[PDB]
Amino acid sequence: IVGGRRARPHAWPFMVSLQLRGGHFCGATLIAPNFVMSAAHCVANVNVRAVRVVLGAHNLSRREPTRQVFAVQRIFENGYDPVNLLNDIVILQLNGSATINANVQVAQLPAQGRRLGNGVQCLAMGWGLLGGIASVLQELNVTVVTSLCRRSNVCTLVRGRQAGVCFGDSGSPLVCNGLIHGIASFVRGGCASGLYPDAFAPVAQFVNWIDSIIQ
Numbered sequence: 143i144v145g146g147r148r149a150r151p152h153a154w155p156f157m158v159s160l161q162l163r164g165g166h167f168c169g170a171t172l173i174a175p176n177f178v179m180s181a182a183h184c185v186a187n188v189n190v191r192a193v194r195v196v197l198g199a200h201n202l203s204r205r206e207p208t209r210q211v212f213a214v215q216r217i218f219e220n221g222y223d224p225v226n227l228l229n230d231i232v233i234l235q236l237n238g239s240a241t242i243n244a245n246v247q248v249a250q251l252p253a254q255g256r257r258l259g260n261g262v263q264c265l266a267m268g269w270g271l272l273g274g275i276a277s278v279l280q281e282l283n284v285t286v287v288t289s290l291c292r293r294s295n296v297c298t299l300v301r302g303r304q305a306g307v308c309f310g311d312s313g314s315p316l317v318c319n320g321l322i323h324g325i326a327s328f329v330r331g332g333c334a335s336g337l338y339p340d341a342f343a344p345v346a347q348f349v350n351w352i353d354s355i356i357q
């Protein structure tokens with residue numbers, strides 16, 4: 143996250159770090175005790191048996207007893223199309239269930255087909271590049287936009303300054319009115335261009351599919 147701020151520790155206890163050999167590569171959202179959701183581009187070309195799913199983290203540079211670590215049991219995809227930048231969503235079934243506590247919660251999702259209007263106020267977040275790469279979870283105020291956005295995305299823009307999501311933020315949730323409406327998918331013009339909006343996978347478009355998998 144470029145131009146964001148440090149989150150309060152454990153403020154977004156649904157927030158997940160996907161790791162390989164101890165290092166963060168992507169975000170995710172805990173959507174049930176035994177399922178996370180992320181971006182499909184996060185796990186394209188990745189050894190998913192190597193993937194560690196880290197719950198309850200805040201400061202990645204630190205040893206944290208609040209953490210719960212899982213492996214990936216199964217993956218579920220929904221027609222990922224990298225060429226057309228479509229269906230950038232994956233569900234990763236964990237090898238065990240999370241212990242739901244202060245530090246580890248299941249996110250709330252929107253109703254199916256719920257569209258967000260121009261001007262909706264959201265919170266983007268993640269452990270991606272800062273413009274270094276972040277130790278402490280970052281968050282950022284973003285506004286939903288329809289210009290320079292396709293109907294197959296929710297797009298956001300910070301107005302009046304250059305800020306937005308960046309590399310390592312891939313797969314991270316976009317929280318809008320307390321619901322996960324986005325999964326960070328792609329940027330244009332580099333990170334934080336002040337020109338192109340950030341594009342997210344539109345979670346509301348995939349709710350019936352998500353529900354079917356998690357119950």
Ligand SMILES: CN1CC2=C(C(=O)N1)[C@@H](c1ccc(C#N)cc1)NC(=O)N2c1cccc(C(F)(F)F)c1
Nearest residue numbers: 183224227228230307308309311312326327328329
């Ligand atoms: C490097 N990584 C990130 C990446 C692409 C990629 O293929 N891998 C690649 C990409 C290609 C297809 C689809 C689809 N559908 C989504 C992303 N293009 C791209 O813009 N990013 C990227 C860079 C910075 C931030 C973000 C994010 F946080 F917004 F998600 C994504």
Ligand SMILES: *[C@@H]1O[C@H](CO[C@@H]2O[C@@H](C)[C@@H](O)[C@@H](O)[C@@H]2O)[C@@H](O)[C@H](O)[C@H]1NC(C)=O
Nearest residue numbers: 190191192193194195211212213214237238
């Ligand atoms: C589920 O897996 C947890 C983490 O396993 C570790 O990470 C994966 C990606 C591999 O590298 C693996 O060799 C590591 O052991 C375990 O800590 C946890 O006990 C597992 N839960 C089960 C089996 O119920």
Ligand SMILES: *[C@@H]1O[C@H](CO[C@@H]2O[C@@H](C)[C@@H](O)[C@@H](O)[C@@H]2O)[C@@H](O)[C@H](O)[C@H]1NC(C)=O
Nearest residue numbers: 262263264265282283284317318319320321
């Ligand atoms: C910055 O965002 C703050 C927190 O955002 C609110 O809560 C999160 C969980 C999301 O639901 C988001 O939709 C909400 O707006 C706000 O309290 C604050 O008003 C925002 N400030 C500006 C000017 O955008």
